[PDB]
Amino acid sequence: PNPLVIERFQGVVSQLFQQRIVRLGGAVDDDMANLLVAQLLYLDSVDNKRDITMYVNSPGGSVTAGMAVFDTMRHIRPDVSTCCIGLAASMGAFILASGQAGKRYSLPNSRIMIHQPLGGAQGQATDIEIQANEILHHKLTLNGYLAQFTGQSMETITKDTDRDFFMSPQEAIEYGLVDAIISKPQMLQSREV
Amino acid sequence: VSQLFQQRIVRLGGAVDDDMANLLVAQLLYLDSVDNKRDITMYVNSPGGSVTAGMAVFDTMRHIRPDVSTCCIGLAASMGAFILASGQAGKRYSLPNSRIMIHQPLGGAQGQATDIEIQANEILHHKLTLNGYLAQFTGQSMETITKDTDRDFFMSPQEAIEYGLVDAIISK
Amino acid sequence: SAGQKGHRYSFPHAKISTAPPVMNRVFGQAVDAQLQANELDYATKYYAAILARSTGKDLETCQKQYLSRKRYFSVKEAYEEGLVDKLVPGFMLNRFRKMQK
Amino acid sequence: CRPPGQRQSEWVDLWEAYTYQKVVFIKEAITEDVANNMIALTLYLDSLDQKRIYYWLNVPGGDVVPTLALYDTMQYVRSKTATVCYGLCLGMGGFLLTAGGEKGYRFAMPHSILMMHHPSGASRGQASEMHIESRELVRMRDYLSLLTSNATGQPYDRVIRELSRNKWMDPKQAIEYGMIDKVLTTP
Amino acid sequence: KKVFMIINSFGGSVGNGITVHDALQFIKAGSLTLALGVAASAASLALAGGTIGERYVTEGCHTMIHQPEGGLNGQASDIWIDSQEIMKIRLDVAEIYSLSTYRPRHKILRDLDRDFYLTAMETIYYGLADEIA
Amino acid sequence: SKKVFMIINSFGGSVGNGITVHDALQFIKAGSLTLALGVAASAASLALAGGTIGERYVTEGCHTMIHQPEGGLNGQASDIWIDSQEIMKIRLDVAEIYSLSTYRPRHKILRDLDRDFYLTAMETIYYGLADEIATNEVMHSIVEMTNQVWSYHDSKQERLLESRA
Amino acid sequence: RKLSHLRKKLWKEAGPPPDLATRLFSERIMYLGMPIDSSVAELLTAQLFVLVQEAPDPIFFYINSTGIAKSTTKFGNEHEAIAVYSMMKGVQKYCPIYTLCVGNAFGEAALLLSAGSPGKRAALRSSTIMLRQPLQRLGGMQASDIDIYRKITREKTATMAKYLAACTKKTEEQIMTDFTRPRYFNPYEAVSYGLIDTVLEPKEERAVFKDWEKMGSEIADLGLWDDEEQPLP
Amino acid sequence: PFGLLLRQRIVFLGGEVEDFGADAIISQLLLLDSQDPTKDIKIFINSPGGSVTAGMGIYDAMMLCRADVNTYCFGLAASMGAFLLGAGKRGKRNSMPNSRIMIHQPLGGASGQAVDIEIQAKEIMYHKANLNRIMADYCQQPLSKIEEDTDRDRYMSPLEAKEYGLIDHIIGGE
Amino acid sequence: PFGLLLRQRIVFLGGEVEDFGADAIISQLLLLDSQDPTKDIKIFINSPGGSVTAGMGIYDAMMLCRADVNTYCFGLAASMGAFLLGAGKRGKRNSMPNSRIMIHQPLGGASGQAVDIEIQAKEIMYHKANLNRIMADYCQQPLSKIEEDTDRDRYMSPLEAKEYGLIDHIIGGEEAVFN
């Protein structure tokens, strides 16, 4: 909320950007996704081989903005490796899963949440038909891509994501979303006999 | 503020909060990093503040290397007054027309009998700690200081000279 | 004050106070504010007339004492000046009753 | 629907006139207020004598604890209870529609819309506070599901799986499902 | 001896119109329904609910007919379920209009689609009313 | 008879209003039984003190409160001074009431006013706000007193209903 | 004397009146069914005074209260419950007071549940009787209030414990050790503790067993790493 | 003033932890890992805590840093500044002598119905188990008394907490 | 443009005077003193009042300055700008021919326990005495007359003030002084 502290944060973000580290923070919405797409397209422009790293920390967001980010990730030449720090909920999870195959990492204590799209519909009855059909199409596309990525069947994803599915990162390695956990060796405390 | 900041001037202005305390602490730590000898001066003008933020500022003032001379401009009230009273000995100045107030801590609480009793005895802890430090800084005993802090004690700069909070006046 | 002489009652801890009349904020030229001042001066002279008839004092005196600044009267000060005349009939305190028992 | 309708000799309010005939019209979603009024009315009506109490419901929803309190009051009274559905019975209203007169005394108007869903709720605090609240709400789901299953005759496990989302029914689906017993017509 | 329902309602939820229609049909002695000024959807159902042969509209009155409205909120499957019920409501309203107008139900559904306005004579011809005051 | 019955369970109220109710209870020529249930803040405590001596009962779980009035001032410097004189004179009024209801020294009562002072039933008797602790047998006696006093009106009502029926 | 005139009040005065409150007061029924507050306590005291004055005939007291309020909304004081409780204890020697819990009785109302005449004190089998965590959600005080505040809350909490031991015939040490977290009894547990004397089972019971939901399958094979399926009942 | 310390490898975790502030701190710690894999990183803490999601993210970032992480406490470390205060290297956790440290168990948010509340209660049981585990790991204390003390919010003086295990030094010995 | 004027040792005090506004002006005067000790400062006062605390802060800063601090009021100087304008060096206070000068007491209040109410009444009474004592000295008028005048709500033209002792010169030669 501090414009000067926001200026510190944008300084840090730009210094990161020079290292091809892109940031997915806060709810995915139109403007943040447009900025994120611009960053990815520029980092494509600079070099066509060096890997991009996408830090992911989001409690959610709209499906169309998240799909803009997802398609931009999959279009560019460099392999985007997604890394979840904090929590990746329901579109941070989708973006995190959508990262380059073999390069989806996560920190040990992070939290990965998947569930079917939330939304709304208002208007006359026929407009509600239209909007319900569109939400169901978003659900079908998200579940199809999650089944494609995680290696499960579309039925298993459809039934898991039906409600809020929370997972620890070792759990997400086993499930299929993440591909490794980034932690450093810690000195082994010795217990008694 | 920067125009003052390069002059080794740290402004404790307005009622203290945690954001103001963060800014003061960052300024003080940076200024100690720049020069550990040459002095820091600090203008005090505040009607109060949270006790924890004031305690943070007071500890940051204490353990850094330059002496933090405190000059009161305008007013110092019961939490800015404690900060003013904590400047380096011999270097707690006042302007001739400034006023100095001391009074007990404040704050609310909500919850079960246990939780709000815990808040009650932490407020007692704040009161004890502040009285002990004020006794260290003025020279008066725990009893006189506790009586003074018990009820709103408005004072003139001169009285604060003979009551120990300030070291001198800037009539110079 | 405007009750019958000899028949103005109060509770022994009633607070009485007399203040100048007050208008509410209206906007305009100097003429509108002058008109309001004229109206407020009619009101002040009216209250001074009633208080002169009640407290038995000079009219301008009653204007000066009461209506000139917001002044407070205890029951005894108000009785001293003719504001009130008596307590309510039959007022007898509790421990006083006890000690007459 | 205000005008007092004439009674045995005087003008009495429409809803008071109805309750003079044991008929209890419930027309608002069950909040603490309406539930208390209807619990009080049920107790007094059982006090006058024991004949039967018809409940005409137009309930579009409501809160869980007040509805269960009203249900327990209906079951506590000596006089039997029949529930008719004028308009619609949603959620806890659809649960009250399965609260009176198990033996074939739940009716519905032909175009009445019926809906049941697992009771909602929301509460936060400490971690352990959320444990206590979550356990209580699961107890509540299970109790209302036992009541629904024993009212309609559907398997308990079926009800659990069905009502997790919203469940909507036309009166023909409600007869076939066991929710109600008869549909009112011109007779 | 016959409920004489004067109708002048610029709007209302359609479900309440259905409920009043059912209440009307519930009593056995016929119902007269006289519309004044306007009879919108929740009251157009009430107007169509009177006794065929005894439903009157006034020269100035206009009849509104439209599909029900709704707001939904929740997960994707909640939205699907809620859409399914609003469709059930619209189908029921079309059925009621078909019973009163004796016109193809699919045609009535097509006419419900958007807001539909009928003058007094078009109300008579459509079938919602029988005579003019 | 016509001895007034005040039932007091009040957690607040302006002090001036408590003084008013106290004096009102005072000018009634018959007795006045005041029973405090559960609580009586400054206003309600002044109401309780105003009952007839020998009939100011307080229930075991009742907590009265002696404290000075809480105010707020807005105006010029002379307005500030004259209004603070309001409030100080009201404090002296309350000290006078508590002395002429408790026999405590007005100095000690003023100190008790300075910092809000809560009192439980036994201590409330001790200072002099109430005479008897309303325990269950006392409460039984009070509802008996209500029985006897209301029964005259009840008998009048009996005869009227006999006529009408 | 007054029996025939309760009758006559019914004939001329108390039959016509429309208000459900008036009909209930005619039937000597006091429905405590709302967060108990100052207005509620004064109403109940007025009702109970007049109900005594009518006759030594009994009183019915239905309790569906969520405490002084819900924890998510501003609380009142604990003094309303003490006021009503003391009025009831004073009344009881001259008038039986059946106290019946429909629905819920949280904290303060639990006292009002336990304050009915012994042997005439019941709760429905599907009710809950909560001795909830003590108390005061009012948090609008300052530090200048600390010196008084402790001497209030104990002053309130301990007062309740005492009254609860005068209704359950228990040791106040147990009640103090039980306050620390909201402990809410079943009706049978309540009769065991002493809060109520009977439990009102319904004429007919509906809810049956649900233990047929249990799986009972074999223990998992040691060579079957279970997947991460997190299900719902 | 903060940026002029960010060149001296200092991070201010002041104020309530929220999504934006925690995201900023995570970004700064990524940056400081980038600049030098060896030089010390000092984190100053002054906070009544915040989200347990964001706090656990900061914890993960702190234990991602291949550099050393010092923690210093200014004034209030409460319920997530305490957790992140103890998370510094063993032997490099400091507080001001007049700082208050208070330990606590997480808190959750609200969306929906009883199944959703089940989901969130499972989340928060997991979070409480994880906080107790890690906290009882770096304090070298059994899980029994960590479960006991976290459930009761009790402020602690730096010497008291140092005996507890959160901090290794007090700046001044006072 | 204010940078060039600050180079010319001209300080503007315009609009409502407040705590932060005071700290800024105090700093400007200290800078102008520590840079140059022999060259006068000019402070321009167009202010409808302020806080007594902040006003006395600026007044202390003005009285510390070795370099004689002139003041030049324009438009309004209401009850706290007027005091500061009267606190310039004697003989070097100026005003525009049609500025309006007001002398008046401060407001206030208090709440809760009337202990703080009596303390606030004592503090408002201190402010009254403090301001009036220095006002009497520079206006060169009896303290009783100053105490009476600081009560009365009233504006005055710079001609009336120049007679009253507050200001000393009118910029315009009293040729555009209008009543």
Q: Residue I6, SS3?
A: helix
Residue G11 and residue F143: Cβ atoms within 8 Å?
no
Element (H, E) at I113: strand I109-113
**Chains F and G, touching by 3 or more CB pairs within 8 angstroms:** yes
* A149 Cβ neighbours under 8 A, 6+ residues apart: A97, A98, A101, A176, A177
C-beta of residue I102 within 8 angstroms of C-beta of residue I82:
yes
Token look-up 């956790």 returns: H93
Query: From chain I, which residues contact B within 8 Å (Cβ)?
Result: 19-20, 22-23, 26-27, 31, 53-54, 56-57, 59-61, 63-64, 115-116, 119, 122-123, 126, 130
Neighbours of chain H (3+ CB pairs under 8 A): A, B, D
F115–chain C nearest CA distance, Å: 23
Q: Is C78 left (phi over 0), alpha (psi -120 to 50) or beta?
A: alpha
In degrees, rounded to 5, the angle at the alpha carbon of residue D55 between the alpha carbons of residues D51 and D60 is 170
Cα separation, A54 vs G53, in Å, equals 80
F33, F62, F118, F139: which to substitute to probe chain G, counting the most G Cβ within 10 Å? F139
Under DSSP, the state recorded for B70 is E
Q: Encode F62-75 in three state secondary structure.
A: CEEEECCCEEEEEC
Q: Does D161 touch chain E (CB under 8 A)?
A: no
In order, the DSSP letters of D2-30 are: -PPEE-SSSEE-HHHHHHTTT-EEE-S-B
Token look-up 């300080």 returns: I11
Contacts of H108 in chain A (CB under 8 A): none
C-beta of residue H52 within 8 angstroms of C-beta of residue D126:
no
Q: What are the structure tokens assigned to B62, written together?
A: 């204490």
E81, E86, E99: which to substitute to probe chain D, counting the most D Cβ within 10 Å? E81
Cα separation, C75 vs F92, in Å, equals 14
In order, the DSSP letters of B142-154 are: HHHHHHHHHS-EE
Q: Residue A84, SS3?
A: strand
Q: Does F86 touch chain C (CB under 8 A)?
A: yes
Cα separation, B79 vs D172, in Å, equals 74
In order, the DSSP letters of I30-52 are: HHHHHH-SSS-EEEEEEES-B-H
Query: From chain D, which residues contact H within 8 Å (Cβ)?
Result: 118-128, 130-131, 133-134, 137-138, 140-141, 164
Token look-up 């444990």 returns: D131
Q: Partners of A54 in the beta sheet?
A: A22, A82
Q: Residue B167, SS3?
A: coil
Residue F71 and residue I124: Cβ atoms within 8 Å?
no
Q: Partners of A152 in the beta sheet?
A: none
Give the CA count within 13 Å in the CB-facing half-sphere of A25.
18
Strands A118-124 and E69-75: antiparallel
Domain-embedded: residue I161: yes
Q: Does F123 touch chain G (CB under 8 A)?
A: no
CA-derived radius of gyration, chain H: 16
Under DSSP, the state recorded for G10 is I
3-state helix, strand, coil in chain A (%, to 5): 50, 20, 30
Contacts of H1 in chain B (CB under 8 A): 5, 23, 26-27, 30
Residue B122 and residue H97: Cβ atoms within 8 Å?
no
Give the phi and the psi of residue C4 in degrees, each rounded to 5: -60, 140
Contacts of H26 in chain A (CB under 8 A): 55, 57, 85-86
- Cα distances (angstroms) measured from residue I41 to each of D107, G27, I7, I135, I156: 94, 90, 10, 21, 26
Residue A85 and residue H2: Cβ atoms within 8 Å?
no
Closest CA to H115 of F160, D117, F17: D117
I117–chain F nearest CA distance, Å: 7
Contacts of D109 in chain E (CB under 8 A): 19, 22-23, 26
Cα separation, H25 vs H5, in Å, equals 14
Say how many C-beta atoms besides its own lie within 10 A of residue F99's C-beta.
Answer: 18
Cα separation, E56 vs E123, in Å, equals 10
C-beta of residue E41 within 8 angstroms of C-beta of residue A125:
no
Q: What are the structure tokens assigned to E55, written together?
A: 């439903």
Q: Encode chain C in three state secondary structure.
A: CCCCCCCCEECCCCCEEECCCCCCCCCCCHHHHHHHHHHHHHHHHHHHHHHHHHHCCCHHHHHHHHHCCCEEECHHHHHHCCCCCEECCCCCCHHHHHHHC
Say how many C-beta atoms besides its own lie within 10 A of residue E133's C-beta.
Answer: 13
**Chains G and B, touching by 3 or more CB pairs within 8 angstroms:** yes
Alpha helices (H) along G69-116: 79-92, 108-114
Our count of domains for chain I comes to 1
By Cβ distance, the residue of H14, H97, H155 closest to B22 is H14
Q: Residue H17, SS3?
A: strand
Strands B153-155 and B99-102: antiparallel
Under DSSP, the state recorded for G144 is G
Element (H, E) at D105: none
Full strand arrangement of the beta sheet holding D88-90: D88-90, D113-116, D167-169
Cα separation, I174 vs I176, in Å, equals 6
C-beta of residue A132 within 8 angstroms of C-beta of residue G189:
no
Cα separation, A17 vs A11, in Å, equals 10
Q: Partners of F126 in the beta sheet?
A: none
Q: What is the CATH number of the domain that holds H134?
A: 3.90.226.10
Cα separation, G112 vs G31, in Å, equals 12
By Cβ distance, the residue of E69, E75, E86 closest to A116 is E75
Residue C94 and residue F29: Cβ atoms within 8 Å?
no
Closest CA to H95 of H146, H157, H5: H157
Cα separation, H156 vs H144, in Å, equals 19
**Chains B and E, touching by 3 or more CB pairs within 8 angstroms:** no
- Cα distances (angstroms) measured from residue E78 to each of A77, D99, E82: 39, 26, 6
**Resolution of the experimental model in angstroms, please?**
3.3
Technique used to solve these coordinates: cryo-EM
Cα separation, H133 vs H128, in Å, equals 8
Tell me the count of A-E CB pairs closer than 8 A. Answer: 65
Cα separation, F114 vs D3, in Å, equals 60
C-beta of residue F16 within 8 angstroms of C-beta of residue F47:
no
Amino acid at the residue A152: Q
C-beta of residue F34 within 8 angstroms of C-beta of residue F50:
yes
In degrees, rounded to 5, the angle at the alpha carbon of residue E32 between the alpha carbons of residues E26 and E33 is 100
**Torsion over CA of B59, B63, B68 and B71, rounded to 10 degrees?**
20
H117, H119, H135: which to substitute to probe chain D, counting the most D Cβ within 10 Å? H117
C-beta of residue A82 within 8 angstroms of C-beta of residue A95:
yes
CATH topology of domain G2-213: 2-enoyl-CoA Hydratase; Chain A, domain 1 (3.90.226)
Active site residue F32: no
Cα separation, D181 vs E50, in Å, equals 28
Cα separation, B160 vs A161, in Å, equals 69
C-beta of residue H73 within 8 angstroms of C-beta of residue H45:
yes
C-beta of residue A65 within 8 angstroms of C-beta of residue A28:
yes
Full strand arrangement of the beta sheet holding G104-106: G104-106, G128-131, G183-185
Q: For chain G, which residues make up each domain, given as ranges? A: 2-213
Domain of residue D182 covers: 1-187
In order, the DSSP letters of A108-163 are: TT--EEE-PPEEEEEEEHHHHHHHHHHHHHHHHHHHHHHHHHHSS-HHHHHHHTTS
**Torsion over CA of E17, E23, E27 and E29, rounded to 10 degrees?**
-20
Residue A160 and residue G230: Cβ atoms within 8 Å?
yes
Q: Partners of F74 in the beta sheet?
A: I109
Q: Partners of I95 in the beta sheet?
A: I73, I170
Asked whether the CA dihedral G185, G186, G189, G195 is positive or negative, the reply is positive
- The nearest alpha carbon in chain D to H128 belongs to D127
Neighbours of chain C (3+ CB pairs under 8 A): F
Per DSSP, which regions of B23-121 are E strands? Answer: 40-46, 68-77, 92-94, 99-102
C-beta of residue B26 within 8 angstroms of C-beta of residue B60:
no
Q: Residue A185, SS3?
A: coil
Element (H, E) at I176: none
* I167 Cβ neighbours under 8 A, 6+ residues apart: I73, I85, I86, I93, I94, I95, I101, I158, I161
Q: What are the structure tokens assigned to D157, written together?
A: 């496990």
Q: How far apart are the first and last CA of chain D?
A: 24
* A114 Cβ neighbours under 8 A, 6+ residues apart: A90, A93, A94, A146, A157, A160, A161, A165, A167, A177
Closest CA to I26 of B44, B91, B100, B57: B44
C-beta of residue I14 within 8 angstroms of C-beta of residue I47:
yes
Active site residue H104: yes
C-beta of residue F25 within 8 angstroms of C-beta of residue F34:
yes
Q: Encode chain F in three state secondary structure.
A: CCCEEEEEEECCCCHHHHHHHHHHHHHCCCCEEEEEEEEECHHHHHHHHCCCCCCEEEECCCEEEECCCEEEEECCHHHHHHHHHHHHHHHHHHHHHHHHHHCCCHHHHHHHHHCCEEECHHHHHHHCCCCEEECHHHHHHHHHHHHHHHHHHHHHHHHHHHHHC
Domain-embedded: residue I56: yes
Q: Partners of A80 in the beta sheet?
A: A52
- The nearest alpha carbon in chain I to F85 belongs to I118
Strands I155-156 and I109-113: unpaired
Q: What is the largest CA-CA distance in chain B?
A: 56
